[PDB]
Amino acid sequence: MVLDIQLFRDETGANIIRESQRRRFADPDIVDAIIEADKKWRRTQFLTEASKKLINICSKAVGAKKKAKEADGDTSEIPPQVKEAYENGTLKGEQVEQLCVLQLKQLSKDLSDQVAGLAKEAQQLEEERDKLMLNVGNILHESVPIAQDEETGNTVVRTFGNTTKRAKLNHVSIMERLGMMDTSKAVTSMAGGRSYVLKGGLVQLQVALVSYSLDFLVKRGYTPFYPPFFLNRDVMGEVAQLSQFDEELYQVSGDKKYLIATSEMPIAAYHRGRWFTELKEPLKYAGMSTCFRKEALGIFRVHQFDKIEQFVVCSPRQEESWRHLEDMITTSEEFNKSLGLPYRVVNICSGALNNAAAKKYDLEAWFPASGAFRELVSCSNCTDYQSQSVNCRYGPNLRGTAAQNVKEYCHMLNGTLCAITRTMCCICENYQTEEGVVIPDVLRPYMMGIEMIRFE
Amino acid sequence: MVLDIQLFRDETGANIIRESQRRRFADPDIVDAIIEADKKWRRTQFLTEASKKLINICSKAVGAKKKAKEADGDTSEIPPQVKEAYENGTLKGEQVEQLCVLQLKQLSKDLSDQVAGLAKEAQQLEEERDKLMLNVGNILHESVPIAQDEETGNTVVRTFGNTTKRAKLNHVSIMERLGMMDTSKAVTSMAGGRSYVLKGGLVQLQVALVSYSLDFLVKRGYTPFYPPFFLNRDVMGEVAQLSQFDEELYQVSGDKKYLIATSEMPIAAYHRGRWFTELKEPLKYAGMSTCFRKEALGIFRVHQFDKIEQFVVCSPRQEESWRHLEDMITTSEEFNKSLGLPYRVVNICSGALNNAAAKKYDLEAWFPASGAFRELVSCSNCTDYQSQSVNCRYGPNLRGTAAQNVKEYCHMLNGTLCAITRTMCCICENYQTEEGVVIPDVLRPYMMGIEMIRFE
Numbered sequence: 079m080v081l082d083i084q085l086f087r088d089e090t091g092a093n094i095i096r097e098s099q100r101r102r103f104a105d106p107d108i109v110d111a112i113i114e115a116d117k118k119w120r121r122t123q124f125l126t127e128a129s130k131k132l133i134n135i136c137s138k139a140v141g142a143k144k145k146a147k148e149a150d151g152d153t154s155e156i157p158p159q160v161k162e163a164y165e166n167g168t169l170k171g172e173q174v175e176q177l178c179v180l181q182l183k184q185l186s187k188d189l190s191d192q193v194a195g196l197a198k199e200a201q202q203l204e205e206e207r208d209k210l211m212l213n214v215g216n217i218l219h220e221s222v223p224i225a226q227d228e229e230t231g232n233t234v235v236r237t238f239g240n241t242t243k244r245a246k247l248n249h250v251s252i253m254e255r256l257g258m259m260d261t262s263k264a265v266t267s268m269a270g271g272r273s274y275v276l277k278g279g280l281v282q283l284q285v286a287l288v289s290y291s292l293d294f295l296v297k298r299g300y301t302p303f304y305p306p307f308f309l310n311r312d313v314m315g316e317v318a319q320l321s322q323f324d325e326e327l328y329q330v331s332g333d334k335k336y337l338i339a340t341s342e343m344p345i346a347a348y349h350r351g352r353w354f355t356e357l358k359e360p361l362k363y364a365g366m367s368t369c370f371r372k373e374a375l376g377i378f379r380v381h382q383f384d385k386i387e388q389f390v391v392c393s394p395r396q397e398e399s400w401r402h403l404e405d406m407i408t409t410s411e412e413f414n415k416s417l418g419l420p421y422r423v424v425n426i427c428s429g430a431l432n433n434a435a436a437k438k439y440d441l442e443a444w445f446p447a448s449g450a451f452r453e454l455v456s457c458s459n460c461t462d463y464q465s466q467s468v469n470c471r472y473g474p475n476l477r478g479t480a481a482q483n484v485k486e487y488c489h490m491l492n493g494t495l496c497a498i499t500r501t502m503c504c505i506c507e508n509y510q511t512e513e514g515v516v517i518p519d520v521l522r523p524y525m526m527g528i529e530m531i532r533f534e
Numbered sequence: 535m536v537l538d539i540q541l542f543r544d545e546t547g548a549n550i551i552r553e554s555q556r557r558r559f560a561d562p563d564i565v566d567a568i569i570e571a572d573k574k575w576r577r578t579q580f581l582t583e584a585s586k587k588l589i590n591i592c593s594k595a596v597g598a599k600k601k602a603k604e605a606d607g608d609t610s611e612i613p614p615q616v617k618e619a620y621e622n623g624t625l626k627g628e629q630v631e632q633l634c635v636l637q638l639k640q641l642s643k644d645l646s647d648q649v650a651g652l653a654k655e656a657q658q659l660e661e662e663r664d665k666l667m668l669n670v671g672n673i674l675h676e677s678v679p680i681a682q683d684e685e686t687g688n689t690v691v692r693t694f695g696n697t698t699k700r701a702k703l704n705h706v707s708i709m710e711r712l713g714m715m716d717t718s719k720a721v722t723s724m725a726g727g728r729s730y731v732l733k734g735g736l737v738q739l740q741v742a743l744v745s746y747s748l749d750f751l752v753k754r755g756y757t758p759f760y761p762p763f764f765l766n767r768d769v770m771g772e773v774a775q776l777s778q779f780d781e782e783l784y785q786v787s788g789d790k791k792y793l794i795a796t797s798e799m800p801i802a803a804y805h806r807g808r809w810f811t812e813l814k815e816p817l818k819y820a821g822m823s824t825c826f827r828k829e830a831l832g833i834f835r836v837h838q839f840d841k842i843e844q845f846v847v848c849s850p851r852q853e854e855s856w857r858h859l860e861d862m863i864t865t866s867e868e869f870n871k872s873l874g875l876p877y878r879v880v881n882i883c884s885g886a887l888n889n890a891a892a893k894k895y896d897l898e899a900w901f902p903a904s905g906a907f908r909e910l911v912s913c914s915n916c917t918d919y920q921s922q923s924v925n926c927r928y929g930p931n932l933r934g935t936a937a938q939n940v941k942e943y944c945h946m947l948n949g950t951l952c953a954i955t956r957t958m959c960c961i962c963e964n965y966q967t968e969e970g971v972v973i974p975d976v977l978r979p980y981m982m983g984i985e986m987i988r989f990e
């Protein structure tokens with residue numbers, strides 16, 4: 079599954095999607111292409127269901143005739159009118175019951191052949207529909223700025239700290255002068271481009287950030303979550319876009335798997351096929367993992383890095399996920415304030431939002447030596463978009479419930495707490511002195527009380 | 535290069551290798567096969583050097599003749615005695631100068647062809663020699679127990695704590711009752727077999743162990759080392775046996791790379807092509823990485839796990855590596871004594887040692903509910919075996935040093951400090967109560983002062 083079809087089949091729902099597509103500067107016609115694919119698919123299902131019923135009628139009629147010792151019949155030849163009728167889904171059981179045993183057996187095989195053919199048609203139509211659904215964005219929140227370009231379109235909502243201060247050395251220069259980061263040929267000749275070795279104080283800092291970040295979420299009611307770093311192709315497909323396979327994900331062999339780009343992928347996949355009847359309290363996870371990105375100076379943008387993630391699974395009702403989004407961006411803000419890092423928070427414009435996000439806040443920290451705001455955090459409300467793909471249902475789940483006009487799904491949200499390597503770059507720029515890098519106060523107990531890491 | 539040929543060319547050295555092969559239940563005839571392949575290889579090189587000098591004689595003679603405006607000559611035909619002479623490495627420079635310009639040009643091409651043919655023979659002999667060298671074990675330490683079967687052949691060196699202690703639930707049962715470990719279909723259907731999810735308190739313990747282990751080694755003079763988790767095929771080949779590519783290493787694609795099975799792999803590979811004139815102080819690295827093993831209940835043996843590694847690069851002189859091996863197993867012992875885990879230390883028998891190890895100590899912790907000693911640590915002295923493969927030289931170069939006749943290489947050792955998931959399994963068995971798992975005292979400051987993680 080990619081998206082639930084229910085909204086597309088409703089006139090009001092289809093218009094809500096079309097409007098969201100226009101507001102995202104995306105194609106509204108994708109909604110119409112999905113409805114048409116679904117109409118063709120529903121036709122194969124109608125015929126399959128009708129023909130499965132007629133196969134059971136054939137079997138029961140043969141059984142009745144064999145019991146009554148009725149002669150098997152003159153021929154197995156099916157009347158062309160009968161063939162035309164089951165191909166059009168109009169063949170009545172009363173007409174099937176007029177056939178002899180020989181014809182009922184032939185018809186049962188003919189109907190089974192039709193079902194096999196229709197299943198192949200339905201598979202091709204599901205593939206077409208699913209490909210179209212991948213280009214459908216989540217329904218935008220009403221507060222999303224309407225713009226195509228990030229540069230002009232994003233809205234700065236909040237700022238913190240001294241965002242105009244300048245510093246001498248950038249993170250690359252500082253990490254070089256510490257003697258604690260090696261990105262030379264000694265590393266790239268063994269591990270490929272953009273690979274690195276961290277040593278000494280920088281490793282102590284990395285661990286101090288992992289542990290401080292995890293404790294920071296534990297204190298706020300998140301459950302630590304350590305995932306597998308591998309996902310199979312099928313499962314990865316449910317939590318990643320097609321474009322992520324070609325540009326971002328490494329393939330692992332030795333049954334093909336993919337390395338995770340963030341703990342958001344295995345945490346969302348962990349809820350696949352789940353059904354929470356009620357979520358009086360939301361599910362809050364503190365994901366901890368290495369992240370691997372194909373990405374198709376220094377350690378600002380690398381293939382391998384640690385990240386502490388906020389992940390929330392909540393009720394889809396009473397706009398609760400919107401309250402969680404505000405709490406999650408606030409947590410990322412509080413975290414950066416605790417490190418004494420200046421920043422701004424931006425509300426991402428409609429044209430720049432990834433398909434799963436109904437709204438996204440980025441926290442961009444100030445890099446005083448680089449002289450720029452740089453993204454450290456992304457916090458998104460994915461509402462029920464990922465839940466439809468992984469099939470994570472919500473609501474009453476009782477015996478006797480029929481094909482419900484409205485299937486409810488959980489809401490899911492994800493947000494960076496700390497992308498470790500990039501935070502270390504930001505810390506190095508903001509805490510540099512002539513002697514080295516001052517360790518932010520809150521991190522000192524997490525790294526043996528060390529107050530500064532010195533230039534070599 | 536697999537091994538340096540120098541020890542095989544020495545009669546005493548070759549006898550030392552043959553004896554070590556017999557004492558390891560390996561083939562001593564491999565030594566004689568290598569000597570023979572090297573004898574044929576030296577013949578190709580003698581002939582290559584002779585013909586290279588002869589090519590220069592051709593170039594100089596053609597040069598001198600054209601400067602003296604001498605005519606080309608009557609023929610390009612090479613006298614049969616000239617061809618026989620260069621094919622046997624007996625062609626004299628005086629016999630070459632007697633040839634005309636046309637013959638000298640023909641001879642230079644013929645000698646170039648012979649050099650190309652000799653290079654193909656030399657490469658095939660290098661491949662044979664290297665394939666044989668792969669079945670040559672490191673020279674055994676004289677204290678290694680002589681036996682084939684690890685089950686009965688290892689020698690118990692030391693024991694600590696109550697190694698007969700019994701406990702109620704095993705690590706799998708404990709981790710399940712905690713509600714903090716998931717190895718069910720919810721994980722295996724998304725990440726493959728032997729994959730897992732850790733939650734809550736067990737993640738806090740996982741981080742507490744990583745941080746305590748790193749500080750433990752920092753306090754003992756080790757430099758933290760965070761590596762790339764990928765290595766290219768060429769480089770991985772220098773730090774892994776061919777059996778490891780088949781049975782242990784995952785392949786990564788997106789040049790083809792391999793996931794590291796241990797930080798020992800990238801740390802050793804980091805010293806490739808290096809040369810240390812002296813190591814008055816050794817190089818000590820505290821490796822920190824996730825480890826990935828194909829392995830072709832619970833989290834005792836899984837594909838993905840964290841490990842803190844001890845890695846030492848030292849002088850090959852005065853058996854200094856042997857003092858380091860003692861310090862390294864003592865460091866692992868002191869670590870498990872600080873955690874209060876009972877164990878035994880074993881000296882691994884000759885037949886069970888991997889080819890790189892001259893000697894190996896395993897620390898096998900006592901699992902009181904499982905009722906067994908289980909390997910938590912391996913400490914190996916690889917002497918110069920890995921340094922020959924990665925070309926990590928030591929001391930003076932041969933040329934211009936009358937007293938230097940041997941190519942010296944650094945000594946390398948590696949030893950587990952803490953294999954995090956297996957240590958958590960051990961702590962769970964040893965620290966269980968009716969209410970949960972008591973946190974070892976040393977780890978409490980590393981996990982928010984938590985005294986116990988409670989059953990669900």
Ligand SMILES: N[C@@H](CO)C(=O)NS(=O)(=O)OC[C@H]1O[C@@H](n2ccc(=O)[nH]c2=O)[C@H](O)[C@@H]1O
Binds near residue numbers: 383385455499500501
């Ligand atoms: N699961 C969600 C929320 O964390 C997610 O992954 N969003 S993200 O923006 O793709 O990634 C989350 C964060 O990861 C960091 N990052 C990215 C690439 C890189 O090379 N190094 C980094 O440090 C960036 O700071 C970014 O804001």
Ligand SMILES: N[C@@H](CO)C(=O)NS(=O)(=O)OC[C@H]1O[C@@H](n2ccc(=O)[nH]c2=O)[C@H](O)[C@@H]1O
Binds near residue numbers: 798827841912950
């Ligand atoms: N570099 C050296 C020394 O650390 C090395 O890797 N040796 S080892 O024995 O292969 O591995 C080192 C240690 O890794 C652990 N391990 C292994 C496999 C697994 O599935 N889970 C584990 O926890 C075992 O306890 C073992 O003693």
Ligand code: NA
Binds near residue numbers: 248
């Ligand atoms: Na810069």
Ligand code: NA
Binds near residue numbers: 440453455456
């Ligand atoms: Na982002």
Ligand code: NA
Binds near residue numbers: 696697698699
């Ligand atoms: Na005892």
Ligand code: NA
Binds near residue numbers: 704705903904
């Ligand atoms: Na057991």
Ligand code: NA
Binds near residue numbers: 909
């Ligand atoms: Na071992």
Ligand code: NA
Binds near residue numbers: 934935936937938939
């Ligand atoms: Na010499």
